[model samples]
Target: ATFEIVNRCSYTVWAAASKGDAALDAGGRQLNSGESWTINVEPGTNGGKIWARTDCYFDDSGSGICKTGDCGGLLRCKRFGRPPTTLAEFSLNQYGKDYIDISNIKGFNVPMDFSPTTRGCRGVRCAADIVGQCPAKLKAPGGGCNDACTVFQTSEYCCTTGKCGPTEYSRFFKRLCPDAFSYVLDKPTTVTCPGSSNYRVTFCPT
Candidate 1:
């Protein structure tokens, strides 16, 4: 649904979805309307375009001031990266030839229940509350609990009153499995780093 080849007198304009002109019949094939073209349009289909004017309007450099008919209404051409010093100044309306009905457009931009966890962490400590709780007793650590569910590496045991506090259970596994447990038992362990001696009694202070 695209085709242009303007040169109405000499400002230059050319485009192509293909059809005739090529550049001028002989074999160069006729596309001259100033120059530059490509058109596909296929996604439910229904579009159209075809204009022409090379020496009378879209000024490529010849500058004769040819702003005829729909100068700023649609007909200029050029596509790729950068090329616009002063093709008269630059204006082509926005292109047209009618027929562009688009069949109603259709649904689905994105969203079928979307879910990223309802878009970044839902409730009841995420993972969609362990997908509908079956033997789910994972709620403790506070009155209302579910502080975003994280801690994973197990080896539990932190009975402060009955006696099972391995240094308060390794400081509650460095405060809830500080990125999956650690410290097989040495002394200090704060770990959280690029890796090297990531927390093993390093403190720096006089």
Candidate 2:
């Protein structure tokens, strides 16, 4: 699979992708506004995600703390970054059809778009100004909006139990970004496409 990650935000972002125990592109790279990076993913990659890390500083050895999406405080992260960020998650298995989604369960920092270039499949995006409209109680340290689960940690929002549905907080995200997923088990939002395809992930999409 081919992924073209684009940065349309007004500021710089360090993009990172994680797969299994490894970090794609050596954990992360800086992308100034208006820039983009393309990478090829192996066929067996699964449970991988690509996200943008904002307001970060790293040394030559790839050590730093990104304001948001800071994975183990390393520039080249070997783990999932801190939340209050948006992501494009994908599962590409050679033996099965591929599926992708933009999830808000982790909360939102920047607007994003996820689109496929083939199969006439549908594209999804979240362009809401969540950073501005998020509830005060759901605020994050990095100026991003956090999910209710992250804030409350209650079963209602955390979905720790099997009985879970949308809540006031989930509605906050779902109503704003209809194309994106708000609940953890929101199966109606999942989409699949067979065969090789090129995906475009644009941050801060208008």
Candidate 3:
């Protein structure tokens, strides 16, 4: 599948994707408000996650830091996104089908729309004023919304051992982005899908 990462946030953003051992777009790419990046995935690709870094400044050698979603303080990301980063995640099974979802569990740095380009499969989006509306305790240090798990670690947020459902903070996340994963749950309901359609992750769709 081909993945398109588009940024229209009215500012600069660096896109990063992590799909396990396989190289996803190799490293991160800077995208202006109108720019977009693309990545083609092989079949059976798994562990999909795509996110954006904001307010980044990098030197010529690709070393720098970002206010949000900074991966090891580098322009060329070699790992995953940090906390308070919105995510577009999916996995493909060559033998079976693919599944896709949006995650606000790590918190939100940008509004996102994760959709398929063909095959008519449904998509999920998390487009809310999460950062501005974030409760004082749930706000990130820099710029974004922090998950309850990042701040407090209780059964409600961690779900480490027992039955736990959504907490007040989780409800806040879910209320904004109903289709996305608000917090870690015991069951963590997910669905499967199979299609030849490509995918797109558009930032700040509104």
Candidate with maximal TM-score: 2
Sort order, TM-score high to low: 2, 3, 1
Task: Report the alpha-carbon TM-score of model 1 versus the true structure.
Answer: 0.18
Cα deviation at 163, candidate 1, in Å, is: 98
After superposing candidate 1 on the true structure, give the runs of residues whose Cα lies further than 4 Å from its correct spot: 1-13, 16-30, 33-36, 45-47, 57-206
Better of 1 and 2 by lDDT: 2
Sort by lDDT, best first.
2, 3, 1
Report the lDDT tens digits of candidate 3 across residue range 170-196: 899988888889877723434456645
In model 1, state the lDDT of residue 54.
Answer: 25
Instruction: For each candidate, give its TM-score against the true structure.
Output: 0.18, 0.94, 0.92
lDDT of 2 by residue, 1-206 (tens): 88899999999998888874888656677899999888788776788888899899888888878889889888776788788878788888546677888999998888899899777578889998988888899999777999988888898888889779888899999989877889887655767877566789999889
Of the candidates shown, which would achieve the greatest lDDT relative to the real structure? 2
What lDDT does candidate 3 reach at residue 139?
89
How much lDDT does each candidate structure score?
0.21, 0.84, 0.82
Q: Give the TM-score of candidate 2.
A: 0.94
Residue 93, candidate 1: Cα error in Å is: 26
